[PDB]
Structure formats: C-alpha cells, structure tokens
C-alpha cells in the first residue's frame, strides 16, 4: 500500500493535531489525513499557504482521485507526487504553491 508508507500520510488524525504540526511552518508544507467523512475513501490535503492552513479535499469517485471534475489520478500518491512539481494555481489563483515540504511521520 503505497499510501500507508507515504511519509506525509498521517491517517486518522484530527484537524487540531494537524494544526500543531503545521504551526509556524513555511508555505508549501503539507500533509494528508483521512477525510472527516465516513470512509468514502476520502482524504484531506492540508497545505500551509500565506500563514494559514488550506483544507483541500481529495475526492474519490469511480476508481480515481483528484481535486475536482475530472478525477484522473489512479492513486493519492500519484496525485501528491504530481503537485510536488507543479503549482496548484490552476485550481485556485490563491494557491500559487507546490507541495514543497512534507510533514514526515518518520521525521
């Protein structure tokens, strides 16, 4: 399971725990947790940008993953890996960042 071994995936932690980790960190710092929803296989990307934590929803429909219509990524790691090298600006002009610094559960 590529996702469970991903250093930046923290599974079932709270909004409050994530806020502790993201506190005072540089823009581009990010982790992924499970969505507060009941297991739609849904995850939440939290991203540091402009001094606050952006909550970005990772949708899971058919067998695909993504931030909006259409869902085209075959895994959440594939998705996150993509936006490590490409800004999220095309989804929302306020989000002119990449996923730069992973919050690592090994580190």
């Amino acid at each position: 399971m590529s996702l469970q071994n991903a250093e930046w995936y923290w599974g079932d932690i709270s909004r409050e725990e994530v806020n502790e980790k993201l506190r005072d960190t540089a823009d581009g710092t990010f982790l992924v947790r499970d969505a507060s929803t009941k297991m739609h296989g849904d995850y939440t990307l939290t991203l540091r940008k402009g001094g606050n934590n952006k909550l970005i929803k990772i949708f899971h429909r058919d067998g695909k993953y993504g931030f909006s219509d259409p869902l085209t990524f075959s895994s959440v790691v594939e998705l996150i890996n993509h936006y490590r090298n490409e800004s999220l600006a095309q989804y929302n002009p306020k989000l002119d960042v990449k996923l730069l610094y992973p919050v690592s559960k090994y580190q």
């Binding site: 909550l55 970005i56 259409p70």
Partner: peptide
C-alpha cells in the same frame, strides 16, 4: 475560504 478551499474543475 469558508472551510475547504474551492478548487476549479478542468472540464
């Protein structure tokens, strides 16, 4: 944003 960041569709 209000809670979750609005992300635009590409379709």
């Amino acid at each position: 944003s209000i809670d979750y960041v609005p992300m635009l569709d590409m379709k």
